[PDB]
Design a binder for this molecule. Sequence first.
Ligand SMILES: *[C@@H]1O[C@H](CO)[C@@H](O)[C@H](O)[C@H]1NC(C)=O
Ligand SMILES: *[C@@H]1O[C@H](CO)[C@@H](O)[C@H](O)[C@H]1NC(C)=O
Ligand SMILES: *[C@@H]1O[C@H](CO)[C@@H](O)[C@H](O)[C@H]1NC(C)=O
Ligand SMILES: *[C@@H]1O[C@H](CO)[C@@H](O)[C@H](O)[C@H]1NC(C)=O
Ligand SMILES: *[C@@H]1O[C@H](CO)[C@@H](O)[C@H](O)[C@H]1NC(C)=O
Ligand SMILES: CC(=O)C1=CCC[C@@H]2CC[C@H]1N2
Ligand SMILES: CC(=O)C1=CCC[C@@H]2CC[C@H]1N2
Ligand SMILES: CC(=O)C1=CCC[C@@H]2CC[C@H]1N2
Ligand SMILES: CC(=O)C1=CCC[C@@H]2CC[C@H]1N2
Ligand SMILES: CC(=O)C1=CCC[C@@H]2CC[C@H]1N2
Lengths: 206, 205, 205, 205, 205
Amino acid sequence: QANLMRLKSDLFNRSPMYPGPTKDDPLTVTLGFTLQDIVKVDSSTNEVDLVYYEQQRWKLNSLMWDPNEYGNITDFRTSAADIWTPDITAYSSTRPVQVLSPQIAVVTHDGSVMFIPAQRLSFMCDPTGVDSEEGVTCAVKFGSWVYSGFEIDLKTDTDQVDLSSYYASSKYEILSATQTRQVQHYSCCPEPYIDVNLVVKFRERR
Amino acid sequence: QANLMRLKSDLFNRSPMYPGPTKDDPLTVTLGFTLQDIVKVDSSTNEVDLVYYEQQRWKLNSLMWDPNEYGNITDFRTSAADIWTPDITAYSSTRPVQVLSPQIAVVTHDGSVMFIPAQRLSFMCDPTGVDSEEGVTCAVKFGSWVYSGFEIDLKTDTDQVDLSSYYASSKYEILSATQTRQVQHYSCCPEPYIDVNLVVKFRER
Amino acid sequence: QANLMRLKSDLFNRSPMYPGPTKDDPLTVTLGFTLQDIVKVDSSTNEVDLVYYEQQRWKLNSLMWDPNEYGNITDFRTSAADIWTPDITAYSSTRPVQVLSPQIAVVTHDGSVMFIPAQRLSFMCDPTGVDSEEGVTCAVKFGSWVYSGFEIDLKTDTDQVDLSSYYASSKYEILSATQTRQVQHYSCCPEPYIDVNLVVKFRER
Amino acid sequence: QANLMRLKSDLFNRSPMYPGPTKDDPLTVTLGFTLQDIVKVDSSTNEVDLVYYEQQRWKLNSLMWDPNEYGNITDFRTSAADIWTPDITAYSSTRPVQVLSPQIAVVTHDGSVMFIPAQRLSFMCDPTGVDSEEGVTCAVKFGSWVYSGFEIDLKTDTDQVDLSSYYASSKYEILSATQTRQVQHYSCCPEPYIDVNLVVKFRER
Amino acid sequence: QANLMRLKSDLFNRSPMYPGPTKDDPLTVTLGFTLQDIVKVDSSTNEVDLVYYEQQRWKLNSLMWDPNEYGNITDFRTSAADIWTPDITAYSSTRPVQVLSPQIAVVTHDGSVMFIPAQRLSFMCDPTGVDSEEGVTCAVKFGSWVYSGFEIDLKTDTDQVDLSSYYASSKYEILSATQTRQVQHYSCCPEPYIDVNLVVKFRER
Ligand SMILES: *[C@@H]1O[C@H](CO)[C@@H](O)[C@H](O)[C@H]1NC(C)=O
Ligand SMILES: *[C@@H]1O[C@H](CO)[C@@H](O)[C@H](O)[C@H]1NC(C)=O
Ligand SMILES: *[C@@H]1O[C@H](CO)[C@@H](O)[C@H](O)[C@H]1NC(C)=O
Ligand SMILES: *[C@@H]1O[C@H](CO)[C@@H](O)[C@H](O)[C@H]1NC(C)=O
Ligand SMILES: *[C@@H]1O[C@H](CO)[C@@H](O)[C@H](O)[C@H]1NC(C)=O
Ligand SMILES: CC(=O)C1=CCC[C@@H]2CC[C@H]1N2
Ligand SMILES: CC(=O)C1=CCC[C@@H]2CC[C@H]1N2
Ligand SMILES: CC(=O)C1=CCC[C@@H]2CC[C@H]1N2
Ligand SMILES: CC(=O)C1=CCC[C@@H]2CC[C@H]1N2
Ligand SMILES: CC(=O)C1=CCC[C@@H]2CC[C@H]1N2
């Protein structure tokens, strides 16, 4: 306990706050989704509710330490409020995202962070035909709201969404689920913005 | 990072807080909307729900810096709580506005700020006739709640609402969507208050 | 900018915080309502939902200043958290009040304040007969929760509720709307408590 | 203003906070409910929604002062954050409590406190037979969540619930309503816990 | 009062806060559930709502004291925000957990802690068949969200869920309710994570 107390004191109390990524010092956030459930569908408003967790990985030099100097500590769990986190935002959401898990990140000696918030999202999705064989396809872009590609780039480990925790007695079955890097442009800003497009094909069980 | 850390420290912690606009130092805020979706309509309460994001823009001398002095940093991203934001409020809302995006702005070396919050708004609107060819028109005014035209004026870069991000499989389609400056008066106060009137015509697809 | 920062620092940072009204130093608060909309009715729970804003006026010696000392500043806007605000509560509410506007007040050189929060309220009201010619009448008392008539007194500038911003295409029309000072006694306490009673008569249009 | 400012600073800023009651220094809290409305019933989930306020009363030596030393001030209103308050909880709630009033207590020179928060509670109650002449009976225990009888005891001035502010046009009329001290035991702990059982008889009118 | 004030000051004001467990200094948290009510069942979305409280227990050396040094004080109540608490999370929830009790822990002189928050939980569960005699079985895992078995182990004092405070007039009755330790692996991480699997069998009475 005593060695970790020193480490956290040395990293946070002394040091000034990391101001976020820049053009000169850009960052790459790795994103991956695990789908737990499609909970609800609203055919009158075209809203659909997903329950999932979103694995986020990035790396900062300012969070580095030498394990010999702090009793062989290679990593620690700390509150997400203590560190900077990327502003990863669903682009077609219809409600504020509901937080389902503790906001605690794992920081490792090399400066790499792992942060996995569990979320419930309501987003825009036409569910007409969900009760047929073909099913329906819906998409939602996840990316930084304010940082362009020149400050925050994104990537995935795999293009396949993790469905090994998907609820087996859900009212919907997943036919496919993919997560793909995209480049988009918007009216505000001349520079490109990056997102991870979550494309989920699904239908009712029988 | 080191030069930006300095810049943020020199702007916020070093200085006293900007008290907001006055009649002596008036401010002009540019507004623009991009309508993403008309999510819901309630014919029994005359409430309609919009999802959009609102491009806000203003300029303060107190947020200026010489980029030469801070490693050629022309601009930076920062939390909206670190700076003064204008109090742009919907005048015919029926619920608290639900925030859908990060509250983070972009500040540039000349003092100019850009801030684009995503919002869900429930507002007063009669949807009777939306299931027809002619459809229904509806309006909501966005302006400062507490500052008059002598302290905060508004303008638009375009009268046309950006519909390029409108949900293609929405239950309603937009026939027209405009954003226009207005001048209004209210009982409390003798001086004129300014707003941008968002007028949307729509029907069932 | 410079003289207003000074003024706010001299009023707020310098002084110890105003502890509120007392029997020795009492305070009168003027209330006026402007009704925007009767949004919803619920005949299964006897709840009705209003949307209004509520003009609150009062005056403190501790908020006085001389404009000649601070560059001829006669008034300013500031956050409601920077000052004491009266604890004006609806006595028959069924849900927590939903705030629809920024919490920013206006303060004038003579120590007077103006604060006008927009609110959505769910309150106790039986709407049985709203669909008839005669309509229904309902009432809600607005007053301090903890201060008596010896500390906080209330009055109205007019007994007529302002209906000039009422929603023209509402599901309900207003037949009458009044705001009247009352004196009430309660079981806890020996001393009288003051309220303004909002009485509204309405029907389906 | 000056004498109250001194008093509050001497009570609060001067001393370290009260750490709650102990076995050595026990504390008795007087509870009393005034029932305003039975708002809703759900026969499919057996939940019932009450709106009420709750008169809490206790006495601390550390809140004592001599009125001669502070300009004859016998009492004052102060924010409930500034003092310790008892953790009185409903033992069969099905939703978080919704706060309907400001959180302000009245403190008196002999160390006694009066705190009366207004609340909406959803709690467990089978409403089958509410549409008959006999109606239904439903109970809810109010007590400390963490303090036993050795640290917090309870009592009532009267066992008759205050119905003088009950809503006359409610969906349900109250036949009777009692509030009675009780001792209980739980699995965690060997020591007795105290509650006031709020028993309410009602029916549709 | 004076002796507890010293104790809390020596434990909390002096010390830097406990930084959670590590691989080199692991921690065992004992969990126990008491089910009060199955409030709601939703057969269209396969969500079910439980009301319960969750007895948590653990022991830190940093929370130890000698009772002879602080006037024979063997234990005390204090806010959960003053100390570290485990991040015990329901793994198959569909809404944010709703807190129904005060967040107050009981600390004892040997370093042991007892913390019993009451919660309402919406979790994934197919209720189809609940109206039969066989009923339905449903399960939810409770474990740390971020700490593995190397940092946080779990256990139970009994395999049986406490049903002695289960609501007698609930729409559903409990056929069996158990709480069992399990080991799991997840895609992120090579190391094993511990949970207590709450398995509840139930039907309509
Ligand atoms: C760290 O690891 C080394 C082995 O490389 C060992 O000698 C030492 O005792 C370990 N622990 C600490 C606290 O340094
Ligand atoms: C800033 O840019 C100028 C030329 O435009 C260059 O000479 C100077 O080295 C730059 N400064 C830094 C810190 O990179
Ligand atoms: C300020 O007000 C005084 C008194 O009305 C007036 O005579 C003077 O011109 C004003 N001066 C400035 C600097 O505004
Ligand atoms: C307090 O009240 C008494 C009444 O007997 C009065 O004579 C005295 O002047 C008062 N003192 C102060 C300080 O208010
Ligand atoms: C603690 O307990 C002992 C034995 O009962 C007693 O004699 C002593 O007075 C107690 N301590 C204090 C400070 O009262
Ligand atoms: C700077 C900023 O907030 C934004 C930048 C571009 C990406 C999207 C659309 C508008 C908004 N978020
Ligand atoms: C000063 C203030 O808050 C206001 C000024 C005028 C505009 C509207 C109506 C009343 C309120 N907001
Ligand atoms: C002091 C206090 O809180 C109160 C005073 C009287 C007015 C109403 C009823 C009881 C409560 N609020
Ligand atoms: C210590 C504590 O919080 C408790 C003590 C007994 C009373 C009820 C049931 C369990 C819990 N609240
Ligand atoms: C690192 C972290 O937060 C996690 C670790 C494993 C347990 C579950 C699944 C993923 C997430 N929570």
